Amino acid sequence: LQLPWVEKYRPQVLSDIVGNKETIDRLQQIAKDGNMPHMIISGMPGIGKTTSVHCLAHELLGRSYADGVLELNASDDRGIDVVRNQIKHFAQKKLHLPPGKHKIVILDEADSMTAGAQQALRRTMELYSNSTRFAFACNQSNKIIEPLQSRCAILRYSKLSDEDVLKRLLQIIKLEDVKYTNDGLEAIIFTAEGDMRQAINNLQSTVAGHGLVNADNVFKIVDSPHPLIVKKMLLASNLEDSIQILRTDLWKKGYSSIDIVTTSFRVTKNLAQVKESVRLEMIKEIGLTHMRILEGVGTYLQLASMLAKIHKLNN
């Protein structure tokens, strides 16, 4: 069959990863040099952490990749016994590698690892660092215990810029010979919200549905991120405007009340314009409405009353 473009066009070399130019350049330097230290790679979903670690391991180990890499993720058994036996035996293995090259243990989604396993990892890292190096990949670097962080170089991946997403989208379009327009690519990038995976999925969906990637065609399938709609609803200077946004853009589109209130809390946490007193009062009202929704009264009237209270506070 035909693979989805998200997996079909997964970068296979470090030079095809867009964004985080400084970090990717440093990874390329490490690959060409060899002296890879223990590292932690943190960042939001779909920005290239897994791809970056895999590409770096491949470039470092060459043909020895099969015998020199041990990959484990949240879908595998990773308990304390695994650390005691499998990882320990891999780190004990004597493998002849070119100078400056070490075995690599990739621990994808390391944040989910249990406390006992993480504590056990300390001793193996202490003992087998001369021949083995650890690459953790996670979304929250703080979920790795401090004794493990103390041994690793930290690398934080930032959200991808519109320029990098556009460049990769153009490369994919050229490879696939896809017909498009500037407004269509703008809409895809705007709906991706910095997630390259979502951008590729939306591009593929639009192409399959209609082929030509225009703004109207993109917005027929893809929806604008509802956090922005919630921000617009909260920032409306008129009660009727907020109510109209809540009705037309969220309620009648099938968005659940619980999702609306959770997104409202998340957005209100990041409103830079408002004062602290107003912000905390809005948070209180959102929390009370959330309590009411959890009890079973998830009605449009409750959300309208929440908006009315927020507007009252703004005055």
């Binding site: 099969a66 015998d67 036996n85 499998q86 035996h89």
Partner: protein
């Protein structure tokens, strides 16, 4: 009897053996019972990837009556745990039980099992359940596209399975190759904590009765071509208990990635069908080639 199906026997070994063979498929799940003039079959499936069917023919029962006319067969579903617990409690005095009778009166009635002793009879009725939409016939060997066939002695295969289990085997690879001068190579290659290990079956007509590679069409024999099947040991090991009583085992692998094991112990016959993994990693392929060459 007035029941639509009624079969009575004096050999309690067959029933307990069948339950023992069905146990590895899960102590708490469903079992399908098929009833027809030919006999009575127990069927179990796991994870839409493995299936076992154990048949009890008419000859095994001293009495067998199938009076249904509208339908040539009857299908029902029961819970394995219920039967297991009931038999375990009832079979405590195995020396005294003299007769065992199974009965069924069609859809809407329970599956009745009676243990008849010299003066005491114990009757149990198992409630039946709707049969899942999944079709047992879905997982079957394509008889027209056999990649290879082999006949093996039960004892040797059972010993090999025991060895694989005792080393904590995680992945299994069935390797089958044929050459001239009646040279045959059937082997099981295991990936485990020990690394890669091999168990080779001798090329003698005492344990490996025959081996043939058909080039994926069941007809043309090809020499020098190796057929490799990659399986998860979790599913492969489920035939160990069936091999324990097995007298002969017939392996048949098709091109669609289906392996069928027919176990022969008048007698109890078993058929286990399993699917293989999608593909073999480069490291595993290299290690297998190095082990076999």
């Amino acid at each position: 009897l007035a029941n639509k199906f009624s079969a009575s026997t004096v050999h309690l070994e067959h029933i307990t053996t069948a339950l023992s063979c069905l146990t590895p498929f899960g102590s708490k799940d469903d079992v399908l019972i098929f009833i027809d003039a030919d006999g009575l079959s127990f069927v179990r499936e796991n994870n839409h990837v493995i299936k076992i069917q154990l048949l009890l023919s008419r000859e095994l029962f001293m009495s067998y009556s199938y009076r249904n006319e509208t339908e040539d067969h009857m299908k029902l579903c029961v819970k394995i745990n219920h039967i297991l617990d009931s038999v375990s409690v009832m079979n405590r005095n195995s020396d005294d039980i003299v007769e065992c009778t199974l009965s069924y009166d069609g859809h809407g009635s329970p599956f009745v099992l009676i243990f008849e002793d010299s003066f005491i009879s114990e009757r149990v009725e198992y409630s039946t359940y709707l049969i899942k939409d999944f079709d047992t016939n879905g997982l079957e060997l394509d008889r027209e596209r056999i990649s290879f066939e082999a006949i093996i002695k039960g004892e040797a295969l059972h010993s090999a399975l025991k060895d694989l289990k005792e080393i904590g085997c995680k992945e299994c690879y069935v390797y089958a190759k044929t050459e001239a001068n009646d040279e045959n190579v059937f082997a099981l290659i295991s990936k485990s904590q020990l690394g890669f290990s091999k168990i080779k079956l001798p090329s003698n007509r005492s344990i490996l009765e025959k081996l043939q590679v058909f080039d994926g069409d069941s007809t043309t024999v090809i020499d020098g071509f190796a057929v490799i099947g990659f399986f998860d040991f979790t599913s492969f090991d489920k035939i160990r208990k069936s091999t324990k009583i097995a007298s002969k085992v017939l392996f048949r692998m098709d091109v669609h990635g289906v392996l069928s094991v027919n176990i022969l112990s008048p007698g109890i016959v078993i058929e286990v069908c399993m699917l293989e993994k999608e593909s073999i990693d480069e490291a595993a392929q290299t290690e297998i080639e190095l082990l076999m060459e």
